[PDB]
Paper text:
Human Eg5 (KSP, kinesin spindle protein, KIF11), a member of the kinesin-5 family, is a well characterized mitotic kinesin that is required to establish a bipolar mitotic spindle. Eg5 forms homotetramers that can attach to neighbouring antiparallel spindle MTs and slide them against each other, thus separating the duplicated centrosomes. A number of small-molecule inhibitors of Eg5 have been identified, including MK-0731, pyrrolotriazin-4-one-based inhibitors and the quinazolin-4-­one-based ispinesib, all of which are allosteric inhibitors that bind to the unique L5 loop region of the catalytic domain.
Depending on the molecule, the N-terminal 15–17 residues as well as the C-­terminal 2–9 residues of Eg51–368 are disordered, as are a number of loops; in particular, loops L10 and L11 are absent from all four molecules. All four molecules in the asymmetric unit depict the final ispinesib-bound state. Helix α4 rotates and moves by around 7 Å in the inhibitor-bound state compared with the native structure. The benzyl moiety of the ligand is buried deeply in the hydrophobic part of the pocket, where it stacks with the Pro137 ring and makes an edge-to-face interaction with the side chain of Trp127, as well as hydrophobic interactions with the side chains of Tyr211 and Leu214. In addition, the benzyl group also forms an intramolecular edge-to-face stacking interaction with the p-­toluyl moiety of the inhibitor, which in turn stacks extensively with the mostly flat protein backbone of Glu118/Arg119 and also interacts with parts of the side chains of Arg119, Trp127 and Asp130. The chlorine substituent of the 7-chloro-3,4-dihydro-4-oxo-3-­(phenylmethyl)-2-quinazolinyl moiety sits in another mostly hydrophobic pocket formed by the backbone of Gly217 and the side chains of Leu160, Leu171 and Arg221. In three of the four chains (B/C/D) the primary amine of ispinesib is oriented towards the ADP-binding site, and while it is mostly solvent-exposed the amine can interact favourably with the anionic Glu116 side chain.
Numbering used by the authors: 17 to 57, 62 to 247, 256 to 274, 288 to 366
Write the structure that this text describes.
């Protein structure tokens, strides 16, 4: 199962209007092509598993990319979904989403929901209707400046840092010490567990500079089903791609890993950055993986729009082989 790479273009921000930028990016959903106008203020075309226009709705993404994958979670296969791109291109919007402000929508009925709310809701829905003894445990670890933080725990201070060591009896696996896996009774529990985590994030933005921009958010869900069956979904929200070129250790390392795998060069540097070691099976491994790439249409972001694209195209080539748990 080759890694699924899919490109998502968001509408022009007011900031791009004020930078004067015109539109350099055309998204073709049918042909699944992205075309970038490099030449002037003539074009380059790329072909991805999916292409998502500026008109893409959150549920759309959920259906095309996420639903199939969660279906493969029920079978007990581990799966990872990356969200990659330049800051402000929409990575957090995809992984999380937002509430409609003047609307009365319940978070489960809200059009603006990103992948995480949606998935969490559905697991309870589908598996209640299935009704077979499921239990859910969700942890979230953010990597900043090569340090590990557990957001989810209430009892821990925002500052405290976990320790990671190569897994015993796994080797491929890694153990993050003191990472809280907080079992979820129900969705109305989901909202609280995530909400406190958002409060911790607000505290830690003040603690660290350009936190929101340089951090990697690794969200993990582990479902226990009876019959036994175990499934694990990693929703990863990467630090902005802009720092990367054609700084961030873990991000730079992720690029190196993708490059090595596509290249076929002998050494792939899993060891170097926390993200690659934790997410090691996500890359050239037994975990089914997809990548949502994110880009801006406006001309001023062109070098970045190209960089993002170059990674995804390259990452298309990489070979994955997923297996049931
Ligand atoms: C429909 C909706 C409503 C509020 C939000 C929102 O702003 N946040 C913050 C939600 C949110 N917070 C998160 C915090 C962390 Cl640390 C990691 C992930 C999330 C996340 O995914 N969300 C979205 C959400 C919404 C409803 C239920 C669960 C998750 C919380 C109110 C739950 C997002 C989507
Ligand atoms: N497809 C989209 N449609 C409308 N607004 C979007 C879309 N993608 C991103 N945005 C908005 O653009 C801004 C940047 O979003 P964010 O997801 O934080 O980017 P990133 O996390 O990649 O830096 C936010 O105001 C966000 O709500
Ligand atoms: Cl705007
Ligand atoms: Cl949307
Ligand atoms: Mg972000």
């Amino acid at each position: 199962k080759n890694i699924q790479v899919v490109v998502r273009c968001r509408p022009f921000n007011l900031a791009e209007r004020k930078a004067s930028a015109h539109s350099i990016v055309e998204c073709d959903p049918v042909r699944k092509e992205v075309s970038v106008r490099t030449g002037g203020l003539s074009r380059k075309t790329y072909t991805f598993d999916m292409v998502f226009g500026a008109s893409t709705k959150q549920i759309d993404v959920y259906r095309s990319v996420v639903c199939p994958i969660l279906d493969e979670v029920i079978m007990g296969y581990n799966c990872t979904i990356f969200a990659y791109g330049q800051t402000g291109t929409g990575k957090t919007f995809t992984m999380e989403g937002e509430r409609s402000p003047n609307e009365e929508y319940t978070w489960e009925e809200d059009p603006l929901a990103g992948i995480i709310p949606r998935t969490l809701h559905q697991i309870f829905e589908k598996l209640t209707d299935n009704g077979t003894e499921f239990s859910v445990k969700v942890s979230l670890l953010e990597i900043y400046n090569e340090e590990l933080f557990d957001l989810l725990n209430p009892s821990s201070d925002v500052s405290e840092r976990l320790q990671m060591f190569d897994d015993p009896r796994n080797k491929r696996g890694v153990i993050i010490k003191g990472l809280e896996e907080i079992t979820v009774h129900n969705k109305d529990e989901v909202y609280q567990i995530l909400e406190k985590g958002a409060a911790k994030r607000t505290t830690a933005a003040t603690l660290m500079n350009a936190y929101s921009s340089r951090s990697h958010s690794v969200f993990s869900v582990t479902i226990h089903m009876k019959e036994v069956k175990i499934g694990k979904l990693n929703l990863v929200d990467l630090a902005g791609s802009e720092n990367i070129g054609r700084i961030n250790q873990s991000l730079l390392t992720l690029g190196r890993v993708i490059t090595a795998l596509v290249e076929r060069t002998p050494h792939v540097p899993y060891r170097e950055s926390k993200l690659t070691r934790i997410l090691q099976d996500s890359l050239g491994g037994r975990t089914r993986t997809s990548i949502i790439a994110t880009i801006s249409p406006a001309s001023l972001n062109l070098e970045e729009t190209l960089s993002t694209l170059e990674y995804a195209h390259r990452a298309k080539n990489i070979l994955n082989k997923p297996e049931v748990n």
